[PDB]
Design an enzyme around this catalytic site. Structure first.
Site, PDB file in Angstrom:
ATOM      1  N   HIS A  16      -4.444 -44.374   8.135  1.00 45.20           N
ATOM      2  CA  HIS A  16      -3.911 -43.008   8.369  1.00 45.20           C
ATOM      3  C   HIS A  16      -4.835 -42.190   9.277  1.00 45.20           C
ATOM      4  CE1 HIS A  16      -1.281 -44.136   4.966  1.00 45.20           C
ATOM      5  NE2 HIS A  16      -0.416 -43.414   5.671  1.00 45.20           N
ATOM      6  N   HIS A  54      -2.779 -44.116  14.287  1.00 40.61           N
ATOM      7  CA  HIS A  54      -1.448 -44.037  13.624  1.00 40.61           C
ATOM      8  C   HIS A  54      -0.648 -42.858  14.195  1.00 40.61           C
ATOM      9  CE1 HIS A  54       1.662 -44.170  10.548  1.00 40.61           C
ATOM     10  NE2 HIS A  54       1.313 -42.965  10.117  1.00 40.61           N
ATOM     11  N   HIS A  88       1.685 -35.552  11.964  1.00 43.28           N
ATOM     12  CA  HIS A  88       2.470 -35.816  10.732  1.00 43.28           C
ATOM     13  C   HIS A  88       1.563 -36.264   9.594  1.00 43.28           C
ATOM     14  CE1 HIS A  88       2.275 -40.120  11.484  1.00 43.28           C
ATOM     15  NE2 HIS A  88       2.736 -40.279  10.245  1.00 43.28           N
ATOM     16  N   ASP A  89       0.347 -36.736   9.884  1.00 47.66           N
ATOM     17  CA  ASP A  89      -0.605 -37.182   8.821  1.00 47.66           C
ATOM     18  C   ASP A  89      -1.957 -36.445   8.937  1.00 47.66           C
ATOM     19  OD1 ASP A  89       0.703 -38.991   7.023  1.00 47.66           O
ATOM     20  OD2 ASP A  89       0.474 -40.641   8.466  1.00 47.66           O
ATOM     21  N   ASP A 135       7.398 -43.712  11.523  1.00 42.53           N
ATOM     22  CA  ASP A 135       6.280 -43.832  10.562  1.00 42.53           C
ATOM     23  C   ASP A 135       6.097 -45.288  10.158  1.00 42.53           C
ATOM     24  OD1 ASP A 135       4.129 -42.802   9.224  1.00 42.53           O
ATOM     25  OD2 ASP A 135       5.320 -42.375   7.394  1.00 42.53           O
ATOM     26  N   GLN A 140       5.303 -58.058   1.186  1.00 45.80           N
ATOM     27  CA  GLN A 140       5.893 -57.663   2.498  1.00 45.80           C
ATOM     28  C   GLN A 140       7.409 -57.901   2.458  1.00 45.80           C
ATOM     29  OE1 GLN A 140       4.244 -56.163   5.389  1.00 45.80           O
ATOM     30  NE2 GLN A 140       2.999 -55.683   3.602  1.00 45.80           N
TER      31      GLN A 140
HETATM   32  C1  LIG Z   1       3.368 -52.967   6.618  1.00 49.15           C
HETATM   33  C2  LIG Z   1       3.471 -52.133   5.389  1.00 49.15           C
HETATM   34  C3  LIG Z   1       3.874 -50.747   5.511  1.00 49.15           C
HETATM   35  C4  LIG Z   1       3.962 -49.957   4.287  1.00 49.15           C
HETATM   36  N1  LIG Z   1       4.319 -48.625   4.064  1.00 49.15           N
HETATM   37  C5  LIG Z   1       4.243 -48.403   2.715  1.00 49.15           C
HETATM   38  C6  LIG Z   1       4.519 -47.144   1.968  1.00 49.15           C
HETATM   39  C7  LIG Z   1       4.305 -47.462   0.469  1.00 49.15           C
HETATM   40  C8  LIG Z   1       5.303 -46.687  -0.394  1.00 49.15           C
HETATM   41  N2  LIG Z   1       5.194 -45.352  -0.712  1.00 49.15           N
HETATM   42  C9  LIG Z   1       6.265 -45.013  -1.495  1.00 49.15           C
HETATM   43  N3  LIG Z   1       6.508 -43.645  -2.044  1.00 49.15           N
HETATM   44  C10 LIG Z   1       5.921 -42.375  -1.639  1.00 49.15           C
HETATM   45  C11 LIG Z   1       5.780 -41.515  -2.865  1.00 49.15           C
HETATM   46  C12 LIG Z   1       6.347 -42.307  -3.999  1.00 49.15           C
HETATM   47  C13 LIG Z   1       7.101 -43.432  -3.334  1.00 49.15           C
HETATM   48  N4  LIG Z   1       7.025 -46.143  -1.652  1.00 49.15           N
HETATM   49  C14 LIG Z   1       8.250 -46.259  -2.400  1.00 49.15           C
HETATM   50  N5  LIG Z   1       6.429 -47.183  -0.971  1.00 49.15           N
HETATM   51  N6  LIG Z   1       3.866 -49.561   2.115  1.00 49.15           N
HETATM   52  N7  LIG Z   1       3.684 -50.531   3.091  1.00 49.15           N
HETATM   53  C15 LIG Z   1       3.266 -51.944   2.968  1.00 49.15           C
HETATM   54  C16 LIG Z   1       2.954 -52.560   1.590  1.00 49.15           C
HETATM   55  C17 LIG Z   1       4.259 -53.141   1.086  1.00 49.15           C
HETATM   56  C18 LIG Z   1       4.148 -53.747  -0.294  1.00 49.15           C
HETATM   57  N8  LIG Z   1       3.258 -54.710  -0.658  1.00 49.15           N
HETATM   58  C19 LIG Z   1       3.482 -54.956  -1.951  1.00 49.15           C
HETATM   59  N9  LIG Z   1       2.769 -56.040  -2.737  1.00 49.15           N
HETATM   60  C20 LIG Z   1       2.613 -55.888  -4.168  1.00 49.15           C
HETATM   61  C21 LIG Z   1       1.836 -57.146  -4.456  1.00 49.15           C
HETATM   62  C22 LIG Z   1       1.094 -57.525  -3.197  1.00 49.15           C
HETATM   63  C23 LIG Z   1       1.442 -56.423  -2.220  1.00 49.15           C
HETATM   64  N10 LIG Z   1       4.506 -54.191  -2.412  1.00 49.15           N
HETATM   65  C24 LIG Z   1       5.049 -54.184  -3.771  1.00 49.15           C
HETATM   66  N11 LIG Z   1       4.925 -53.421  -1.367  1.00 49.15           N
HETATM   67  N12 LIG Z   1       3.177 -52.718   4.135  1.00 49.15           N
HETATM   68 MG   LIG Z   2       2.135 -39.459   5.699  1.00 43.85          MG
HETATM   69 ZN   LIG Z   3       2.309 -41.712   8.711  1.00 44.50          ZN
END
Ligand SMILES: Cc1cc2nc(CCc3nc(N4CCCC4)n(C)n3)nn2c(CCc2nc(N3CCCC3)n(C)n2)n1
Ligand SMILES: [Mg+2]
Ligand SMILES: [Zn+2]
Length: 313
Positions: free
Chosen positions: A68, A72, A106-107, A217, A269
């Site tokens: 961040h 970004h 934005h961040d 984003d 992912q």
């Molecule tokens: C390239 C990339 C981009 C990315 N952006 C984000 C945003 C995360 C986010 N924020 C919110 N909110 C905001 C407020 C409440 C809800 N939500 C909803 N999601 N995650 N992210 C990931 C990780 C993905 C992942 N990797 C696992 N794995 C778990 C086990 C190993 C990694 N999971 C589950 N997801 N990779």
């Molecule tokens: Mg943000």
């Molecule tokens: Zn951002």
């Protein structure tokens, strides 16, 4: 006055494409941003001396966190630049002006922690802003920087145009709260399908700009595989640090933020591409056809993560 920004030939060409990477040379990022405002908005949208002073105060108020950060900010602005250039005639002079700045800002002053960690730490920003904690802070930091002497890039706008641009930027920045994305997309999906979606309805533009903001984003998933993979390392470097901090407070972090669940990244992912990225770029392509390359690139990278699981890389 008669001062064009130009880029070397490879950048001049490749900056127009959705999958463009702004490169590892930090000192060219402001030139890249100014180039995108000049071509997106015109060379007369902003006084150059004020724009440059605004760009450099914005840069100074991004922190050296792994993901961040300033890189970004400029990455997310370039994806917005790509959307605006491929949908030229759909957007007002104010939206063009507002949205590139929204993306850069934005961040602002992100600390490398989720709204969630602020709330469980009981950070002061969590008491001042009960929901979209960081996102209200990012908008607040934008207004502060705009109110610095010699920084009001919107000085030439009317009293009403000024209030309209600040309102576009506020909604745009709030929409980067991914907790607001799921509802926003489901609503855009329904309205597009039933035919109710109307771009003259201001509250409909708001949702569509909101979806663009999510798309820009998340644009790390729309890059060339090696950029996508290496940005993922930076993203998890923050999440795992936040996990560590969760454990310091006496809390099991979710798997996403647990460095103990490294092994599960590829599957994580998949979930994220299927639950978040693919739906985002699908609905966006439907509403704005020329954004299809983001969907296509996202699908390619999902397919690269599938290959990672199957031992093929
Ligand atoms: C390239 C990339 C981009 C990315 N952006 C984000 C945003 C995360 C986010 N924020 C919110 N909110 C905001 C407020 C409440 C809800 N939500 C909803 N999601 N995650 N992210 C990931 C990780 C993905 C992942 N990797 C696992 N794995 C778990 C086990 C190993 C990694 N999971 C589950 N997801 N990779
Ligand atoms: Mg943000
Ligand atoms: Zn951002």
């Amino acid at each position: 006055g008669l001062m064009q920004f130009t880029l070397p030939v490879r950048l001049c060409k490749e900056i127009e494409l959705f999958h463009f990477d702004i490169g590892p040379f930090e000192n060219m990022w402001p030139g890249i941003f100014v180039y995108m405002v000049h071509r997106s908005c015109g060379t007369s949208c902003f006084e150059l001396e004020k724009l440059c002073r605004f760009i450099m105060s914005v840069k100074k108020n991004y922190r050296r966190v792994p993901y961040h950060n300033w890189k970004h900010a400029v990455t997310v602005a370039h994806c917005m630049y790509a959307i605006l250039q491929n949908n030229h005639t759909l957007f007002t002079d104010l939206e063009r002006k507002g949205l590139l700045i929204a993306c850069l800002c934005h961040d602002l002053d992100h600390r490398g922690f989720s709204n969630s960690y602020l709330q469980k730490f009981d950070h002061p920003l969590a008491a001042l802003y009960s929901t979209s904690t960081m996102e209200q802070h990012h908008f607040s930091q934008t207004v502060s920087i705009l109110q610095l002497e010699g920084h009001n890039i919107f000085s030439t706008l009317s009293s009403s145009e000024y209030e309209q641009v600040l309102e576009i930027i506020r909604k745009a920045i709030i929409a980067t709260d991914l907790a607001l994305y799921f509802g926003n997309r489901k609503q855009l999906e329904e309205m597009y399908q039933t035919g109710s979606l109307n771009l003259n309805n201001q509250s409909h533009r708001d949702r569509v700009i909101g979806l663009m903001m999510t798309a820009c984003d998340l644009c790390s998933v729309t890059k060339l595989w090696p950029v996508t993979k290496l940005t993922a390392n930076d993203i998890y470097a923050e999440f795992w640090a936040e996990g560590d901090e969760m454990k310091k407070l006496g809390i099991q972090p979710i798997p996403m933020m647990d460095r103990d669940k490294k092994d599960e990244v590829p599957q994580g992912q998949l979930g994220f591409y299927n639950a978040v990225a693919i739906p985002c770029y699908t609905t966006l392509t439907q509403i704005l056809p020329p954004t299809e390359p983001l969907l296509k690139a996202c699908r390619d990278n999902l397919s690269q993560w599938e290959k990672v699981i199957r031992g093929e890389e």
